Amino acid sequence: QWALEDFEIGRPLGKGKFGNVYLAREKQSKFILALKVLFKAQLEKAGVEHQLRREVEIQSHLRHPNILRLYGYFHDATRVYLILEYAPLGTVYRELQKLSKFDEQRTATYITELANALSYCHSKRVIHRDIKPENLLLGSAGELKIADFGWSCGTLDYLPPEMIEGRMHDEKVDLWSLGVLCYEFLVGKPPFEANTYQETYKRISRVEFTFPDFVTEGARDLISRLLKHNPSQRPMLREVLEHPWITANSSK
Numbered sequence: 001q002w003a004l005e006d007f008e009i010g011r012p013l014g015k016g017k018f019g020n021v022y023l024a025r026e027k028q029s030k031f032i033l034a035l036k037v038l039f040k041a042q043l044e045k046a047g048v049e050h051q052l053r054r055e056v057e058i059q060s061h062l063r064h065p066n067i068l069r070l071y072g073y074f075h076d077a078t079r080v081y082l083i084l085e086y087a088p089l090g091t092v093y094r095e096l097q098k099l100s101k102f103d104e105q106r107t108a109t110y111i112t113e114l115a116n117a118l119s120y121c122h123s124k125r126v127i128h129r130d131i132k133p134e135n136l137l138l139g140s141a142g143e144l145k146i147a148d149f150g151w152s153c154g155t156l157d158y159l160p161p162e163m164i165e166g167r168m169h170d171e172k173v174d175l176w177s178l179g180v181l182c183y184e185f186l187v188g189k190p191p192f193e194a195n196t197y198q199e200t201y202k203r204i205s206r207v208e209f210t211f212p213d214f215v216t217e218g219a220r221d222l223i224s225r226l227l228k229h230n231p232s233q234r235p236m237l238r239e240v241l242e243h244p245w246i247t248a249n250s251s252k
């Protein structure tokens, strides 16, 4: 229903691996949106042609203030194009490099907007992975918005134990990500970082992490409760919005 000639591309937002994302205005009536171009190259270098083709199928059937929108897509002879919502204030990874580490007010609010988005995703029967600071955009008001979802290998940093052990995984995976994220926001780095898979794999498998002095109790109690090896004993996100440290610092 769309084509490359209903759009006017502007400032290059990001130059990535599978393509580029540009600021674009729908010339029909001047709508500001993010337009990502995925070439057949790289994409056809892997079998991800229909791998991230069902990912777009999941994206469209997804409406949420904290979930980045997918308006549509179309195919070229060289590439494919994705019409996405524009997030004025970049990624959380960028804000994280400038501030190095977040406080408790900001972090508690981020895991709140995330718990809501994940809850909606589970109610809509959607399992998510990959969720990391590189995949989180800020809106006009700093509204957190999750992206990618093409994954709905690489750096294991944000993968749960059951997933790397090649075993079974369910909805409780997103509550491990919530734990790893909350740590990274508070500390500045993921709780299982390293220089290799074999080390990170061991560390993530053994669930071996430590706390800097400044990260406080209530935050420790939440990161700890969230980062249990077994898929159970991890609170359902309904219970994570309830946590005292969360509520005592969050926004709504």
Ligand SMILES: C#CCNC(=O)c1cc(Nc2cc(C3CC3)[nH]n2)nc(N2CCN(C(=O)c3ccc(O[S+](=O)=O)cc3)CC2)n1
Residues within 6 Å of the ligand: 013, 014, 015, 016, 017, 018, 019, 020, 021, 034, 036, 037, 038, 068, 084, 085, 086, 087, 088, 089, 090, 091, 094, 137, 147, 148
């Ligand atoms: C500071 C400041 C002001 N704002 C920005 O500086 C700012 C705003 C923005 N607004 C957006 C983009 C989107 C779309 C979902 C893209 N919605 N709202 N995006 C970015 N980015 C996104 C992309 N960036 C990447 O590094 C990349 C990632 C994957 C990727 O995959 S793809 O297969 O090629 C290829 C590149 C890095 C800068 N940066």
